[PDB]
């Protein structure tokens, strides 16, 4: 999930 896991985790990065 290279460009997946840290996407839903982007809004509050």
Nearest to 1 by CA among 13, 11, 9: 9
Residue with tokens 């809004």, as numbered in its chain: 11
Q: Two tokens at 2?
A: 């290279």
- CA angle centred on 9, ends 7 and 13, rounded to 5°: 110
Rg (CA), the chain: 7
Q: Provide the experimental method for this PDB entry.
A: NMR
- For 1, the token pair is 């999930």
What count of Cα atoms within 13 Å lies in the side-chain half-sphere of residue 2?
0
- Rounded distance, CA 12 to CA 6, Å? 10
């Amino acid at each position: 999930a290279r460009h997946y896991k840290n996407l839903l985790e982007r809004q509050r990065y």
